[PDB]
Amino acid sequence: SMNPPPPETSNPNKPKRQTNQLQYLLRVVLKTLWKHQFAWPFQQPVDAVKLNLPDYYKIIKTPMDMGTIKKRLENNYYWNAQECIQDFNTMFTNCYIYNKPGDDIVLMAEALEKLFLQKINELPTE
């Protein structure tokens, strides 16, 4: 029922890059999803205490959210675009794993994911 430590957003010994694909992931992908009317439940780690989801972290072992992704991108945490794309996919997957099919939160994730897929389709060549 308690919250775990959040995912890391800094690791000084993890090697980093700033590539045009990672720049696109911040400037286009994250910014598009962040501003959406359905972004709010995904803008920070799930607070299982405030939201009264005492089983959330029993089920979700790889938490991810856009607050974390935003910080990772701003702090150049990633080596490659695939790591960041995986974080978005983990976020959506967690939502679909935890929640009841057809719930409104699942519709919210689906709307963000549709946009994510449209943007990733045009990921620039390195």
Tab-separated table of C-alpha atoms in Angstrom:
chain	number	residue	atom	x	y	z
A	1	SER	CA	0.000	0.000	0.000
A	2	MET	CA	3.042	2.327	0.344
A	3	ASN	CA	4.773	4.121	-2.530
A	4	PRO	CA	8.148	2.829	-3.742
A	5	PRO	CA	11.074	5.111	-4.544
A	6	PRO	CA	10.410	6.679	-7.952
A	7	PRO	CA	12.322	5.590	-11.043
A	8	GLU	CA	15.729	7.257	-11.288
A	9	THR	CA	16.152	10.285	-13.481
A	10	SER	CA	19.898	10.722	-12.812
A	11	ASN	CA	22.737	8.214	-12.869
A	12	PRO	CA	26.103	9.900	-13.424
A	13	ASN	CA	27.890	6.689	-14.429
A	14	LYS	CA	25.291	5.813	-17.081
A	15	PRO	CA	26.684	7.083	-20.407
A	16	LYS	CA	24.523	9.632	-22.236
A	17	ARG	CA	23.861	11.213	-25.614
A	18	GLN	CA	21.989	14.132	-27.087
A	19	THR	CA	20.905	12.933	-30.527
A	20	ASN	CA	18.408	14.377	-33.012
A	21	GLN	CA	16.059	11.433	-32.269
A	22	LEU	CA	16.195	12.122	-28.525
A	23	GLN	CA	15.632	15.840	-29.224
A	24	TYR	CA	12.528	14.859	-31.249
A	25	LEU	CA	11.333	12.642	-28.370
A	26	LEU	CA	11.387	15.722	-26.108
A	27	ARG	CA	10.350	18.517	-28.496
A	28	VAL	CA	7.658	16.607	-30.354
A	29	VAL	CA	6.655	13.381	-28.556
A	30	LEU	CA	6.731	14.342	-24.886
A	31	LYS	CA	5.561	17.903	-25.490
A	32	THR	CA	2.556	16.651	-27.540
A	33	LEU	CA	1.407	14.180	-24.931
A	34	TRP	CA	2.168	16.488	-21.978
A	35	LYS	CA	-0.168	19.220	-23.153
A	36	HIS	CA	-3.096	16.894	-23.912
A	37	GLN	CA	-6.304	17.182	-21.886
A	38	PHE	CA	-5.851	13.532	-20.809
A	39	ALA	CA	-2.213	13.908	-19.659
A	40	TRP	CA	-2.776	14.654	-15.973
A	41	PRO	CA	-2.967	11.060	-14.580
A	42	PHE	CA	0.378	10.319	-16.330
A	43	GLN	CA	2.369	13.476	-15.464
A	44	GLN	CA	3.933	12.030	-12.267
A	45	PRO	CA	4.542	8.654	-10.581
A	46	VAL	CA	1.383	6.946	-9.441
A	47	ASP	CA	0.729	7.964	-5.822
A	48	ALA	CA	-0.896	4.797	-4.587
A	49	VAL	CA	-1.525	6.302	-1.156
A	50	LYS	CA	-3.380	9.441	-2.334
A	51	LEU	CA	-5.237	7.453	-5.002
A	52	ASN	CA	-6.069	4.588	-2.629
A	53	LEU	CA	-4.624	1.889	-4.872
A	54	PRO	CA	-2.979	-0.316	-2.240
A	55	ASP	CA	-2.347	-3.116	-4.747
A	56	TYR	CA	-0.904	-0.918	-7.518
A	57	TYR	CA	2.757	-1.650	-6.804
A	58	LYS	CA	2.030	-5.286	-6.052
A	59	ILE	CA	0.940	-5.582	-9.721
A	60	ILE	CA	3.101	-2.928	-11.442
A	61	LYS	CA	6.807	-3.781	-11.020
A	62	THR	CA	8.185	-1.452	-13.670
A	63	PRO	CA	6.437	1.881	-12.950
A	64	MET	CA	6.819	4.657	-15.482
A	65	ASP	CA	5.220	8.049	-16.046
A	66	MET	CA	5.722	11.177	-18.145
A	67	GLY	CA	7.107	13.217	-15.238
A	68	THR	CA	9.944	10.718	-15.082
A	69	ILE	CA	10.341	10.650	-18.854
A	70	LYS	CA	10.341	14.492	-19.006
A	71	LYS	CA	13.096	14.639	-16.369
A	72	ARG	CA	15.092	11.888	-18.119
A	73	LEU	CA	14.922	13.811	-21.399
A	74	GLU	CA	15.739	17.199	-19.822
A	75	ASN	CA	18.643	15.701	-17.943
A	76	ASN	CA	19.951	13.723	-20.964
A	77	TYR	CA	19.595	10.413	-19.086
A	78	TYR	CA	19.287	8.282	-22.225
A	79	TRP	CA	21.782	6.800	-24.634
A	80	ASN	CA	19.269	6.150	-27.381
A	81	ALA	CA	15.751	6.767	-28.579
A	82	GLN	CA	14.733	3.136	-28.034
A	83	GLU	CA	15.224	3.515	-24.254
A	84	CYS	CA	12.846	6.455	-24.187
A	85	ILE	CA	10.298	4.796	-26.514
A	86	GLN	CA	10.395	1.795	-24.143
A	87	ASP	CA	9.582	4.064	-21.200
A	88	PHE	CA	6.440	5.392	-22.987
A	89	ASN	CA	5.401	1.829	-23.855
A	90	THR	CA	5.954	0.710	-20.279
A	91	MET	CA	3.716	3.556	-19.084
A	92	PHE	CA	0.859	2.615	-21.411
A	93	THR	CA	1.244	-1.127	-20.721
A	94	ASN	CA	1.117	-0.538	-16.956
A	95	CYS	CA	-2.159	1.323	-17.372
A	96	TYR	CA	-3.694	-1.519	-19.407
A	97	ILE	CA	-2.336	-4.207	-16.989
A	98	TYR	CA	-3.599	-2.553	-13.829
A	99	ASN	CA	-6.978	-1.178	-14.874
A	100	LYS	CA	-10.261	-2.767	-15.873
A	101	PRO	CA	-10.814	-2.897	-19.558
A	102	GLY	CA	-13.070	-0.102	-20.706
A	103	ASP	CA	-12.362	2.244	-17.763
A	104	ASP	CA	-11.976	5.903	-18.570
A	105	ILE	CA	-8.253	5.881	-17.531
A	106	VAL	CA	-7.682	3.236	-20.257
A	107	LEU	CA	-9.370	5.523	-22.811
A	108	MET	CA	-7.057	8.326	-21.684
A	109	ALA	CA	-3.955	6.173	-22.157
A	110	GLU	CA	-5.267	5.040	-25.571
A	111	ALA	CA	-5.666	8.665	-26.716
A	112	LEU	CA	-2.083	9.506	-25.653
A	113	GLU	CA	-0.765	6.287	-27.196
A	114	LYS	CA	-2.443	7.054	-30.545
A	115	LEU	CA	-0.556	10.356	-30.654
A	116	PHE	CA	2.657	8.671	-29.539
A	117	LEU	CA	2.380	6.169	-32.397
A	118	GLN	CA	1.710	8.941	-34.951
A	119	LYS	CA	4.790	10.848	-33.744
A	120	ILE	CA	7.111	7.860	-33.567
A	121	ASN	CA	6.118	6.976	-37.142
A	122	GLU	CA	8.073	10.080	-38.145
A	123	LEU	CA	11.045	9.677	-35.879
A	124	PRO	CA	13.836	11.352	-37.871
A	125	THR	CA	16.782	9.425	-39.287
A	126	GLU	CA	19.889	9.870	-37.091
